[model samples]
Target: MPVLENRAAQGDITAPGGARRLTGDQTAALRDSLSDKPAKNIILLIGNGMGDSEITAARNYAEGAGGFFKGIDALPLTGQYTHYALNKKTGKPDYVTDSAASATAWSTGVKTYNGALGVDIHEKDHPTILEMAKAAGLATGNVSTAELQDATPAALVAHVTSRKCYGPSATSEKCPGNALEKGGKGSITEQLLNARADVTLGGGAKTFAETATAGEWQGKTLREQAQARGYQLVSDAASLNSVTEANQQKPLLGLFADGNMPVRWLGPKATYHGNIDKPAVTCTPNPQRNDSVPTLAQMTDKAIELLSKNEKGFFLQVEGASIDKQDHAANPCGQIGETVDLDEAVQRALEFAKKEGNTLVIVTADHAHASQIVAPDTKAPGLTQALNTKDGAVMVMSYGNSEEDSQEHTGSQLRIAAYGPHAANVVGLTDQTDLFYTMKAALGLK
Candidate 1:
């Protein structure tokens, strides 16, 4: 019933300062559920390309460890959410979907086209749960291993037509403002600078780097603008950890990598799986990329430390992105490794919820990837010989390595788990759009 109205302004937003104490009538206009008081805090964790197979792979990888366990694994409520998207033109469900459309469904409670973000099928902006929570005075945060502008995280705060039109170099025909006819309004980078968010962490320094140095756009970078708006900037893991209640009380911005944070290995030698002649692989890129960039768990921990400061409650979204990237590369080891990393983040939130008592943590995925794990390799000539699998060894496959299959998504349902208050509501089958309203009720939002 609300709208992302009047956001056409160029840059910087300062009006309606802070959240408001709502009247019963005001909240009534927004909530139909038995609204009493909403949860004091809400945490949403997304594994970009995770599915049942992905979780199973991570479990198998950890089985070889000293017994892998996480809070998400022990969650009291669990369910499966369909990842199908709407055709937009036909208004019929499509078998598969993209992150932009799925994230929009979860954030706005509306189905949208494959390339859309926080907008409906008709190319109209919808108020995101994060935006609504902020308007009501709750602090907000966004954390990701991918660039902050990436679909899953961006849907929490941005509304645009095409996910590709990121800023600082908006010369593309489909870039923001240029693709007005396609409903592209502005670059998410610009929209972010023009708005409010309490805490932000993870990769893509280049997205906000120009907020400083010589020849910067408008002579100021977005990070500098954030600083001007009273956000404390921190670069590495040490600085992020050094944050105190006093320091984080003002709002925070942290970018540890220029692009997506590196991906770590999941097992002993060759943690990343490879392809072609044999489905074997190894990975050390993320571990080798930056010793101080902070792991996905560390980023999630710091984000919680700052966002939990809001006495009125806060909304936080943390994404494990490289899981999709490694999966795309046909690297099973790396994909499962990133998945466990995300699970660690989930466990951290659940641990906090156990003590804090009023928070809600939800773990879900945007869509499924073409990855699977079959039986162990056999002595059969046709089965083991053609596929190039070692005798008696497990034959794990991270498909999509082929040039033709790399750029696609599947419509299969993905796992969903929840802990903390109202977690019981997560049980049973649900559609992606159901999450928007389900979370609204969980947060007691109107």
Candidate 2:
């Protein structure tokens, strides 16, 4: 039976180029189709907290016997860039920008204090590309594996003084009343719903659902506001698939979890722990018990499907938000798999760009993790032996005090890769602040 099952799976695999092949003209047309394609749509894939060191470590771990990433090793590539805040000099905490600050650099084309979003050091408010795109009559969307209110994705739509907020519930800590949440008066969740970007999918329903509040329900939740404003609300994977351009008359908002969505290996719903020892199982159950989330690729595909209907084109931001979370936890295995998942999302965008003929796809990291990969030694039996050596063996290092402070972030260079028109422009080293200008230029934004 095992052999039969293995054979059944193997039947789908075949040698490359063995399938039906395109003719010379057809092949030229396809190649021209990609090279000459004008970008009517734009997709930005942000791998938050991923640095060159983390990317190399992940690639090494996923390499075959010959030591190469089968998928990632073959792309039109670009090098990494140093990440530092506007104020700090040493590239340390004083020098290093936190996620919120880094995200603001990309979203608003300006640098701000560590926790501010869509605002600069002067606290000057700025509209994000999402807001601008919507004003230009283009469909806009944001999707992430993290909560919708998380700094990275939220920066695209919300401007705020502080990045931290306890959501609707007031527990042990002082939950900022709605008036003081991330987006000035309202929380990022509320701002996103109010902005009514054509499609918004992520985790953070706790901030939006009335049942999630500790006290009596507020006047109206973010979800309610979205729906009342003629938006479609979906909380599960199946429901996301049910959304189509034909049926979705209004905007779409999906909140898959009460907080950051589950990691890829943990399964879609945050509750489906593959092992009893997983940390998430110990956390308290959310009041909503919302689950049934989809993978990053699924969310990206769906977002493109819905947003691509616009005649004026669209702007969509998809985030692999947890690559950094895993790095923070020092889970090298988890980080590598997350990177692989992110690459899959990139491939999906590439497919769409190929078919549509007018989409710019950019893949980059918000900041580099403190993780470093040492070169391998030849006197090793297996990869483990190479990794375990002390003298000549390669040693992977995490930033900060590895022994004492395992969860701290480090200042490292981030990987930037782009495909489509103006991709060549992203090749050289650049600052985190340059990301916004690069994206704006790609989208033809003045």
Candidate 3:
């Protein structure tokens, strides 16, 4: 008797020449797309853990292998970049990096250990790209699908020994030296308020309810502190849309969820031999992701609108964070949908760059993930799932890094694509730290 009970469900295969074909040679387009000009504004879109395999899987499921994503694949110049973190004890390379360290590398041009944000291995703080841009008189924005206190967004505004130091309580316990009462910089949420970016969007509203343990606002909740500091807090999409202005005097603080924002799509979690035992699954819209929550594209659009008002220019970092989260959960459809959502945000940024000409738009990821496209029939030792694709084909994905539950991040180069002025900087091999200098130079920030 066969070990697997159910037979694999097959999907339609593509015919000859069914894939998308390119038109005539594009020598002129290539030359026109290259630019060495200085950039006035910069928009960096990060798809967390969106490695080459994740991108391919999403493309295959959503647009078929032959099709190209209008937003993600639209960039003229594309290249790969190494994303590795440092070991705190040895100061040596840690091949597999986490979001905190990976993001810090690009945000501060420094490689710190996993779980460390905006700080070196020695616990010394570093100025982030967003902070530098703000200090240089440029409008700055930090947007993410994850909580603002999460690693990706937090690295831009807060310096902490541990990424878990989200609120006063976490700070006091996990990182006492950085706690408010300890006469150090406060928690992530508190430092975010201090950083005072022109626009800060995403979740982590629950953290605001935690009162300040010590300092001027000792017993006050973070929410009250934000209001006292002249922040215009908006919770829903309508309020966020109504806000027409965001600046240092009255910056916008939009937290749509209590924690991380709900993911865009949903599907079954991968299991042992799920690809062969179950029918090919179709991804569906996540019911929890309601209209009340603003999409990443909308946030990006609003952020650009408000930040662009600054004549000196702006720096905006947008993250589709759930891609990494879902990938770790071994949810293929979940990860794919977040990638699609991020692609839309990328579209918005790319559109703005095309029109403004002086704006630089970059699309990349923090690190590689464990998702890999595999043959549909091959039974693997780890979690696997087969999804029905747009072309009616079946694409199987496996998560072999972890045999138990959560998948692990992989050590692989990430695709970094860019457009507009200084776009050529991403055309060849580079390190994650190089991105900070690239953006700094692009925005003419110190």
Candidate 4:
């Protein structure tokens, strides 16, 4: 069996090609067909820290393997937005919003402090898109290449003052500014069990492994509770692939690793030859993780299949998180790999939207990060990098971490690309908060 198999079990209806060539009228056709019809399914693809430069570099690298353009760039509507967060006291633009804040902004339609998740600047809870979608009778799923409880995914369901509060229990020691119980709530993990999205796939298995620290969880294990709540516990690619076999279960809890999933790569031939130094971060796989972790595209394909069974519809948030994490590590190669991986998943959604016809596929990044490609030779984008070790070239770095702005989020503009249902209206300069409204209107939610 294939590592990631498709369960649709359908065959190709049309042959390769014919006189069906279009004179670019297809672009206008898709655009003209755009209307504010209620989208039955919403697939939100968040490429964390993926800026224009990031997409460009990744596409350039994919040229050798996939094609010249990334699916996101090939979309009909391309727009940009500014990402800024509000100060706690004033509730105005204070600084660049972190993934937690940006995810919260898009999730709840409210601007909050940089570290807050599913909460306002005052650290109060709010309904995220997933939470509301679930209550609205739509099947819900949140998939990521990062930890399942990582900032972006957690922000979609868990309310906490700080993004770090992932757990069976959180104390001041675990997360100083915001402990789970301190804020009059359980841990983010506990909240997730209660919120219970239909599908939760990614890493962060440790949060569910209560046996390691049984005392903290009050005698009940997260996995035990999850199964009791009707979640089919899946820990490997094979089991995840068999989700369709148990589709009637209706809910899934898939934790592939203890931390972030392994960064998927485009293979060695795509690697820049004669490189000065390998990036501090590389896509080397863990020995134990060799066959366990499923690719982002695989998880996405499965999530869509299961969630689509809901008649009312589904809301899925699929994140390519390593893009941001690699940037934080100053790993250009790592960033490129993750970005390309994300693009692959985007392509999968594009195909799904085109076939399903009623699914709204939205692709965007939470924030921008500076990553420069200063290869004088103009090599493949991901194949090159900053800090040239060659004798003739000078070292260069991109915008991610400036000496003064290090350890902060980017205040610059980010990109949002969409296809299917009113995608035209969403294509233009706007504030990050507008995303909340766009998705709300797309789903016809009150």
Candidate 5:
């Protein structure tokens, strides 16, 4: 068996003498990069809460200020986009958005309220891009480090009033309108099964333990139901590698953790004036994330291998979910490591897209986070930490939104970059909902 290592942590990432890639500007470079041809496949990569601040922090720590991420910075067309949700009651724009609403915007092309998945502010359900692709006979997949029922992944499959409704128990208590007994679609897990994508990989195996409340498989557990529904269930890398085929006949389901997957690296937590008080430290690999758990890149590789087998091509969404979770918890190292993890997945997608020539790959974040790069030795505010970077200098970061344990999401616009056919659509100012149309047009879907 091979050991799982952090790819970003391995190489020589130091940039010494002015790390600039471009030599001379040519008018031919921009003109040659534009493509209007329809894409045979689309791969969307979302880095949850990975704002400009988050990306800069990670690059400063891991690759130095002059360094660039091969996967993230490799995209040719780059631009900014706004991500805001709508007020459920007033139908007015809410400047700050949550993961559920932000993801729902791109997944369904509708501005929905916070905590709502696959539904608009008025509670009207909308078909997701994944569903549209599946309907067109194209293979589809949803991958994330968060639980499969988490908002980012759920928005592509389930339509519910609350994102908390993960299993039958939660649906019955919180989102009764979406409960099976109430004559609606079951919980997120139930809806995911019904969505029946060619590949669905993530955590949240604990939700599978719950039995159905009222349905054809009423008395059976979700695990049992999935088995009966012809899913090829695999919990470890060994089992996942052994499986050869994944399609509508035998859809693949990989759940490696009971809840959200553990992050890659761990380090000192941000504290009040911690950067000035404590010595700068380097991040270490999290011991909790054992070899059994597959990396986002590995899952992405497998998903593409399976989904790309279809004659009509495929649509896949890969998310690095913990960048948001860690940012909310005011852990800089945690978020940076997840950002690196996401970069690897993006690299994988770009590799495939570059080779296929007909695939469109877009990389962006769901929302902005609270982590900001601050000057070293500054002891300002809520939470702070200092790290020893590749540049051999101390880099200080601050999380000033909340005085409490969890931080807040910011309202700043996010960066959107893409490559391949119709990639020009992502350039310049756009809304989160615009991404749906960009991808829809690229895939030639109505």
Candidate 6:
């Protein structure tokens, strides 16, 4: 790998000084200048749609009298940045970049129009860093809290037009459409079936099981495809635990829920049997049932274990997918809780990095949400008590007030955090498109 000493020292990386190919002596000098850190594994944790403001709001909500992120507030390494996409015209803010486009920016190092994944704005087919790493003989995996097939996760391994394709739209009362509408080529499940990944975890069994498949969406079952490929198909928490002990040579596919796994608030006891009579629970008493689905932390740990077994090293993308969902809903409480969950996942990666001594962990968000927290005065306790205070006391608020649309995604700048080797390079403000190159550099992918 070519190395630049001053670039690493300065922490401001740009694509080679004026693009002149390095001479052999220059290349050797540069390589000699690098710190002899070799990363044996690479893990990128993407908190989809989590911006600085959302993270701050979440930290504030979770903080006790001490003012912390519950646990994340004390981490040793942290960073922030501005996430902006270019409008075809200048001067106007990039107010509408969607997840798919944002994902492409990180996954492909290129900006694309909204609703597109993996491919660039020109619709060019570029291999993902995952594909490149796999081709070089490394194992790869992707996990998410959203439908496994959601765009953020899919961009790591698949290409498509839309972000939704596998399940019923909670926002629209419409039936299922194509793979793009359902979530994108059923990418989460289909990509795993195609052996594009070695270990895959997340919700969306409805898209993989024929009998349980929703709407008129008829297709080959992802489970059957996995089975045909000699993969061990596991569903639910118990099965997820047994994968390592099962000692199977085949790859693993775990689907915990038919849709985006139940949120932390709706754990297992909720009885999805259309029972609205019972009062909804809070604080998630039974994580086994509440997250009834595997957590981003668990999935991250398992993916590292499984992929690391590959002699050729590995690349894994783990997503704190629901922070965006909660933010879109403007559920400050829920969003903060989800952000805490993401931070827990980060802690897991940090632990792994310590033991492995060669894994690179990069944390970031795709974009920000319009969720804002206005300052508070001494006269009032603050927005946290808005429900109790008079109507005007709600200083901190989301931009949209409509219950339905507010829960959906909105325009916002994103945040980025990193640890392990080369992480220092990601700190300052940069385009979302730069993420692709940053990730490539982390993996030495050229």
Better by lDDT, candidate 4 or 3 = 3
The lDDT per prediction is 0.70, 0.63, 0.90, 0.72, 0.90, 0.59
Compute each candidate's TM-score over C-alphas.
Answer: 0.80, 0.75, 0.95, 0.81, 0.95, 0.73
lDDT of 4 by residue, 1-446 (tens): 00011111132314443222232335545546566777888999999998887776665454421234446665666688877888898877876778888888899988888888888977778899888887777889899989888889998888877777777455345654444335445667877877878898888888776521322445667787777667799999999998773233547888988899886642232234324454322234334435667889889999888888788888999999988887766565567778878878888888888878877888899987766655444443343344322222333334324544232356788778888876765677987788888888888877
Please list the residue runs of candidate 4 whose C-alpha ends up more than 4 Å from where it truly belongs after superposition: 1-30, 64-67, 172-183, 211-217, 245-250, 266-289, 375-400, 403-408
Please write out the lDDT profile of model 5 over residues 1-446, one tens digit for every residue.
Answer: 01011123333334542344454464566676688998999999999999888888998888887677888877878899999899999999999999999999999899989999999987889999999999999999999999999999999999999999999999999999999999989899999999999999999999999999998999999999999999999998889888899999999999999999999999878888999888887999999877888999999999999988898989999999999999988888899999999999998998888888899999999999898988897879788999999889999988999876689998999899988888888899999999999999899998
Candidate 1 residues 1-446, lDDT tens each? 12111112222223452222221243543232222345788899999898877776666555421223454465546788886888989989878899899999999999888988888877789999988888888888888999878888888877777787565454135553433233344467656655568888877778785432213235577677777767777889999898874223466777788888878774322122222234543333444646687888888887888777778888898999998887776556677778878988987887777678778788888998867664443222111111222222344453532345353568888888876666656678888888888778888788
Tell me which of candidates 3 and 4 scores higher on TM-score. 3
Candidate 6 segments whose C-alpha is farther than 4 A from its true place: 1-36, 70-78, 86-95, 165-189, 210-219, 245-249, 266-292, 375-404, 407-412
Pitting candidate 1 against candidate 3, the one with the higher TM-score is 3
lDDT of 4 at 240: 94
Tens-digit lDDT track for model 2 on 192-239? 655778888888887776423322224666566666678888889999
Compute the lDDT of residue 170 as modeled in candidate 5: 95
lDDT, residue 148, model 6: 76
Q: What TM-score number comes out for model 1?
A: 0.80
- C-alpha lDDT (0 to 100) for residue 426 of candidate 2: 58
Task: Tell me how many clashing residue pairs each candidate has.
Answer: 9, 3, 0, 2, 0, 16
Model 2 accuracy (lDDT, Cα): 0.63
* Deviation from truth (RMSD, Å), model 5: 4.2
Taking all chains together, the TM-score of candidate 4 against the true structure is: 0.81
Tens-digit per-residue lDDT, 133-215, candidate 6: 77777788878888777778777776654455333232122212224345433343454455447777887777666421332
